[PDB]
Every structure is written in C-alpha cells, then in structure tokens.
C-alpha cells in the first residue's frame, strides 16, 4: 500500500539556465569530419530550465521537505541530475497514471533495467523502498510503493541498467546523470551520458551530446510523466507509513523539448561539438 | 475481494508439530506483513507472531518465543505457521491477519481478520 | 510490558454513552493504541486507531481519546448488535492485547 508524503510543501521551484545542454545525435549514422543540419524535438539553447527539488533537508535537522511532482510532457522532456546517492531509479512515463490507462514504467535493480507499460494504479507518490534484507547487509527493492495494482499488460523489455554508479566515489564531479526522452509514432526514444561535472553548483558550459539507447515499441499516448524516486526504509519507527524513510536528498534538473532545427559540427570520431539558433 | 481462510487446526498431543496454513485472496498479499492471534476459549486475544512480508524480519511473544515459526509462500499466496512443543494452554482458535503495512520492525493494528482455526492439544 | 482495561464488565441498556477505560503500565509510544470489537463466533473487528481515528465503514458512534497512559473508547448510543467484548491493543514496536471488555444489556 501507498502514502501521501507532500502534504504541506508548495514555495516556488528554482530555475537555471540550460547553456549549451541536451544534445543528442538523432541517428545511428556513421559520419566524418564535416557539418550537418537536423531538424526535431529539442531542448531549446539557454532555456529557462526548470529545476526542481526531491527530498529536501532544508532545517538543521528539522525538516524533510519533498516535493516530487507529476510534470506535463508535452512533446519531451529533458531530465538530469546529480544525486551521487543513487536515489533516482527511473520514470512513470503515462497520461494518466491509473488504471483504465496502459501507462510506462521505468525501474532498474542497480544491476539490470526492468520496463513495463502497463494498466497501472501508480499512487499519488511512487517510491521504491530500500532497506536490509537480514543477509549480509543485502536488500530488496520491491516496488509495491509504486502502484496497487498492475494487471493484463502488454509490452515488457529487461536491459543493463542505465545508471551505471561509475567509480567515483569521492565527489566533485557527481558525473551528472543526463537524459533526453521523447515519444513519437508509437515509438519511445532514449539518451543519456554519464559526464563528470567538477562545477560545484549548476549545469556546465561545456558541450556533450547524449546517444540514443533504445527505442521502444510502445504505442501509448504519453502525456504526463513524474519520476521515480528510492528511499531507504527506516527501522522500527513509530509510524511506518509517511515517516522514516529517504536517505540522503535529491534533486533534478527539467527542461521541456521543441520542434527545432540546428547545424553540428561531427568530427573523425563523429562527435558533435555545438549548434545554433 | 479480501478474504483469508486458515487451515490445519485440529487435534494434536502435545510435544509433536503442526503447521497451520492460512490462505490468502483479494489483496496484493505479498505487500504486507502477516500476523498470528490466538484466543483461549474464555481468555482474552493474546497476540502471537507476525512476519515480515517479504520474510526478512520474525517476531514472536515471549509466551511462544523460541517455540513458534513463522514462514510464508508469496507465490502461493499462504500463510504458515510452524509450531513445535505444543503445551497445553496452547490450544485456542487461531487468527491469521494482515498488518496495515510493510510490518518490517513495527507493526500495525490487525485490520482485518480470517475466520479462526481451533487447535487442540492433548493426549 | 502489561496492559489492562476497566472495568471487568460494562453492562448497559441500548443507548446510553459507554466509556472503556484503557490503561497502560508505560506509555505507549506516540499514542499507538488500536481497538477492536469481537462478538462471540466471528472474528474481530478492527475500529479505531491512533486512539482517535475512526477506522473504514465504521459508525460515527465508536470515537475515543487519551495519550501517555491512559485511553478511553468512548460509544455514544448503543445498538443491539453493538453488544460483543471490546479489546484494547497497543501496537509500538510489539503488539500488546488487553484482557478485554464485555458490553451487557442490562434490565
């Protein structure tokens, strides 16, 4: 069963900006050192990016303040984050995120990917419960704090596991986990890459553009996504239901997509370096 | 629709082991924790075990303790009590119940119960 | 740990408020006290918890107060059905079942 753990936080989200950021090549073409124009959805250059915040421990040891919204996805949505705690687990990628209503589904065991699209019942705030599991310090993820009810689904797919928690293990850089998505056709489409960011506080100056991961046979009119986040399940706490939970904070950045045109610069390793409008 | 049947109660003599089943329908049964309360004929509820959903976690009164086993079969949907050295105030109805939540080291209230099973220890 | 309620027996004719003394050895932690009712040949009920909060398909009629050591199950107007043992439980880190509480009808 789920639990309602907002409940009393509205202040306003912050904004940055999105500098030269959420680029991708739009095609598994072999190239070379020459320019090319494309045009599709894109994360406009120096958007106004919204920035939002997950668990938020803004209080010396007061206060827990977590705010995960649903979020409109009009034509893509462009997501990162830094989060050195692997607290972000995927995406609830839907319309309606109910039943009566095949929507998509983003988990991963920190080990492997899990993808459904399904007649889900996600409750108002999905979460993955991560707690000792009475061997070796060993723990199970289980995700009945997602949706109470999943039934009679079609489409299904199993992969390596996009957050890959690359040795770092010191932090500066935070390697700032990154993704593009977007659905057209009934197709549903993946970008990502892990990029170190020493930069202390906001999205970088530097250029990285993401690669397509997979395309998914999907079919579902996605209009509405909210993310997916993973807290630790407390001990025995007075109160399990909206109480103990969440080690560590998070946060993540958000930027929508539009239709767009821009001219890259490929190389001999056929790596873009920037665009323009 | 929720509903829990339990199952295996009967006669035993005492010393010997029974494993009282409790089957489980109309819930995502593999999400929350599953109590044991028993009842003495004229006596009051006295609590029993509860076990962890997932089984990680057990718990046991010490009027059962180090005398009591709880284990249950997500797949099958079931729960299972296993009980050795059956003394003689031991015997009573017993309640098979779900916990409100992931009774994992804390425990809600009962919230709703199966229909009772009637053990009978003697010789 | 022992909770008890009081009294042994409570016996009323259908109508008049009921109260059901609740009392702990310790408090209990955070108010969790949880209360059921249990009529002879079925199984009990689960009605209130939190010691305040009226539970699902519940009547407006079962409420209840108290805090630290000391609860009370309150029934403001009684109903012939509304005749069967009421026990008191706490329910923080172990469960805990109190020795029970009949209601009567008396004449």
């Known amino acids: 069963q789920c639990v309602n753990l907002t409940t009393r936080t509205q202040l306003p989200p912050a904004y940055t900006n999105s500098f030269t950021r959420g680029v991708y090549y739009p095609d598994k073409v072999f190239r070379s050192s020459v320019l090319h124009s494309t045009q599709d959805l894109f994360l406009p250059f120096f958007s106004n990016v919204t920035w939002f915040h997950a668990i938020h421990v803004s209080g010396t040891n007061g206060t827990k303040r977590f705010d995960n919204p649903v979020l409109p996805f009009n034509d893509g949505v462009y997501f990162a984050s830094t989060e050195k705690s692997n607290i972000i687990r995927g995406w609830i990628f839907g319309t309606t995120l109910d039943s009566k209503t095949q929507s998509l589904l983003i988990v991963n065991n920190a080990t492997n990917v899990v993808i459904k699209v399904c007649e889900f019942q996600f409750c108002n705030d999905p979460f993955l419960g991560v707690y000792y599991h009475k061997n070796n310090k060993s723990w199970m993820e289980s995700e009945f704090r997602v949706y109470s009810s999943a039934n009679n689904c079609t489409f299904e797919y199993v992969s390596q596991p996009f957050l890959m928690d690359l040795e770092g293990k010191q932090g500066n850089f935070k390697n700032l986990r990154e993704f593009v998505f977007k659905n057209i056709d009934g197709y549903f489409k993946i970008y990502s890459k892990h990029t170190p960011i020493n930069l202390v506080r906001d999205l970088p100056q530097g250029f990285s553009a993401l690669e397509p991961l997979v395309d998914l046979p999907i079919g579902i009119n996605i209009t509405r996504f909210q993310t997916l986040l993973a807290l630790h399940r407390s001990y025995l706490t007075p109160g399990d239901s909206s109480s103990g939970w969440t080690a560590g904070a998070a946060a993540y950045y958000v930027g929508y997509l539009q239709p767009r045109t821009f001219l890259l610069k490929y190389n001999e390793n056929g790596t873009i370096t920037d665009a323009v409008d | 629709q929720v509903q829990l049947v339990e199952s295996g109660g009967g006669v035993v003599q005492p010393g010997r082991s029974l494993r009282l089943s409790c089957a489980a329908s109309?819930?995502?049964?593999?999400?929350?924790?599953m109590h044991w309360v028993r009842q003495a004929p004229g006596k009051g509820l006295e609590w029993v075990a509860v076990?962890?959903?997932?089984?990680?976690?057990?718990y046991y009164a010490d009027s059962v303790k180090g005398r009591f086993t709880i284990s249950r079969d997500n797949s099958k949907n079931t729960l299972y009590l296993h009980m050795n050295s059956l003394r003689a105030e031991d015997t009573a109805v017993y309640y098979c119940?779900?916990?409100?939540?992931?009774?994992?080291?804390?425990?809600?209230?009962?919230?709703?119960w199966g229909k009772g099973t009637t053990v009978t220890v003697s010789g | 740990i022992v909770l008890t309620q009081s009294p042994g027996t409570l016996s009323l004719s259908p109508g008049e408020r009921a109260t059901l003394s609740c009392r702990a050895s310790?408090?209990?932690?955070?108010?969790?006290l949880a209360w059921y009712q249990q009529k002879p040949g079925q199984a009990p009920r689960f009605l209130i918890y939190?010691?305040?909060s009226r539970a699902t398909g519940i009547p407006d009629r079962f409420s209840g107060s108290g805090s630290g050591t000391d609860f009370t199950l309150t029934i403001s107007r009684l109903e012939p059905e509304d005749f069967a043992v009421y026990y008191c439980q706490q329910y923080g880190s172990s469960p805990l079942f109190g020795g029970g509480t009949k209601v009567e009808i008396k004449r």
């Open positions: 310790q408090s209990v932690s955070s108010s969790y």
């Open positions: 939190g010691a305040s």
């Open positions: 076990i962890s959903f997932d089984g990680s976690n057990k």
């Open positions: 119940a779900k916990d409100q939540d992931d009774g994992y080291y804390y425990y809600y209230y009962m919230d709703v």
């Open positions: 109309g819930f995502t049964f593999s999400s929350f924790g």
